[PDB]
């Protein structure tokens, strides 16, 4: 026979498939996966900084000081916050919370509080602060109320008009929480506060609020038709908050000093702490990957890849494998 030379291309035992415009599942010799699909399935630290895990508590319960939420008195700094879908310990006493989502958005900016007492229970001498407890909100087995706020009632058949104010002498911004009690009926408001038509006025340099408790025939939630409503504001340094009321006033005892502001988030997850550390975290679990993309969850925190809603993203590097 004569001598000859031929031209061809590479082949091997590869079975990696890729998709194109015209074809799906084309076996190629080499390929690059650019989508991270796996996670360890645990809630970890973020660069050695442990998150605040509220267990069965909500954010409202934590800040207001729910009796069941006794671990979360003076919490250390966090990388992120975790909260379950339907936390059983939210507002023990049936009630609402004004600008609750706005407050949660503000917690993304914050990494650490420091609780400080602004108005001690002892100071309320003209009023009876001992009572103002409630069943279905138990502390130590007994009827009780939120820890960080005081339910003030009458004293010796009298509720003198209140005029208090706290001046923020700290250098940090202060988160303050108060509330109003919407009474069950006219008989209850006379029983608790001795004043048919009361009011609650709150005023700072920025804020100026005027409130009045509403009477209504509401449905019995946890054996209590009467309802509570809580509010909040940031008191900047050197600014005072002026309280005035003659009834239905759920006064603050503690405020929260904003001592560190950085990157944080609140993530919906039923998972518990895993004693691990990671650079990237999701509600489903942590991601240790060098990929540019992933499909675990849209909400992440740390140094992560970007979230795609695809099941598969493979790039073809090599050529068509035959056979």
């Amino acid at each position, epitope marked *: 026979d004569p001598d000859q030379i031929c031209i061809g291309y590479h082949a091997n035992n590869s079975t990696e498939q890729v998709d194109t415009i015209m074809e799906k599942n084309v076996t190629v010799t080499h390929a690059q996966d650019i989508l991270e699909k796996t996670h360890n399935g645990k809630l970890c630290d973020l660069d050695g900084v442990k998150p605040l895990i509220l267990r069965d508590c909500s954010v409202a319960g934590w800040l207001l*000081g729910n009796p069941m939420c*006794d671990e979360f*008195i*003076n919490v250390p700094e966090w990388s992120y916050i975790v909260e379950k879908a339907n936390p059983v310990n939210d507002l023990c006493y049936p009630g609402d919370f004004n600008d609750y989502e706005e407050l949660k958005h503000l917690l993304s900016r914050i990494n650490h509080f*420091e*609780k*400080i*007492q*602004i*108005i*001690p*229970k*002892s*100071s309320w*001498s003209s009023h009876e602060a001992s009572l103002g407890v409630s069943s279905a909100c138990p502390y*130590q087995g007994k009827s009780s109320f939120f*820890r960080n706020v005081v339910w003030l009632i009458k004293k010796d058949s009298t509720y003198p008009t209140i005029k*208090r*104010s*706290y*001046n*923020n*002498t700290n250098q940090e911004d202060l988160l303050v929480l108060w509330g109003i009690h919407h009474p069950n009926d006219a008989a209850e408001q006379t029983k608790l506060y001795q004043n048919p038509t009361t009011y609650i006025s709150v005023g700072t340099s920025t804020l100026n609020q005027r409130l009045v408790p509403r009477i209504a025939t509401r449905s019995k939630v946890k054996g209590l038709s009467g309802r509570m409503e809580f509010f909040w504001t940031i008191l900047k340094p050197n600014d*005072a908050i002026n309280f005035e009321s003659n009834g239905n006033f759920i006064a603050p005892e*503690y405020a929260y000093k904003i001592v560190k502001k950085g990157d944080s988030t609140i993530m919906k997850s039923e998972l518990e702490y895993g004693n691990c550390n990671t650079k990237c975290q999701t509600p489903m679990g942590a991601i240790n990957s060098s990929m540019p993309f992933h499909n675990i969850h849209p909400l992440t925190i740390g140094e992560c890849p970007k979230y795609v809603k695809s099941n598969r993203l493979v790039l073809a590097i090599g050529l068509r494998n035959s056979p």
Partner: antibody
Amino acid sequence: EVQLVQSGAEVKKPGESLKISCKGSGYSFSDYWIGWVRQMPGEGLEWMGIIYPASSEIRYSPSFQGLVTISRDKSINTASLQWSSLKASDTAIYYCARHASCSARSCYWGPVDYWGQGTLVTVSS
Amino acid sequence: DIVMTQSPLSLPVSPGEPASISCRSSQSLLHGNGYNYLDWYLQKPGQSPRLLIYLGSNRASGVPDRFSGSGSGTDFTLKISRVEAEDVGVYYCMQALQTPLTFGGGTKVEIKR
């Protein structure tokens, strides 16, 4: 109502260890700060330190820190005060007293509204 | 620490006439809320110390009308309208703004005759 019963009285010699105690009743022991006050014979009151029995966070005095160990136990509503090696200068009367009931780390530490009977600790050769 | 200074050291007072004790602070005890974090305590002879005044001016449950606290910030005073054999003892003022808590030097008050 509120009751603070102490575990006096004690007599020891220099070098010996000691643990005086104080039992609170009529309230939530874990909720209130509880502490100790020394009064040497003929002299005034000397605040030693307090402890929050829920968290066991202790607020020592610089004069007494690292020299006496304050303790607390929720299970039997008891606060204590300890010594490693006693001296003649420790011969005094030690008052147990309830404080604030503030859960924060910066607040009105008073009123010191309920005091014990004191325990006489005598220390000599 | 916050050092506290009381005066006078001894105070002989006649049964009818009143009495007054000064208590000065090294640092302002006035809080952002408006209240002064200062208490007064009475130690009757042979007895333990007892709460008399808090927080600046309010009378403790069992304290008669004669006793009254006043002042603000750095300088305070405990006034007594009438004094009797029951009221003898060492009166202590103490600050409760910052840890560690500090008591005053004490004011011994006997009956004058």
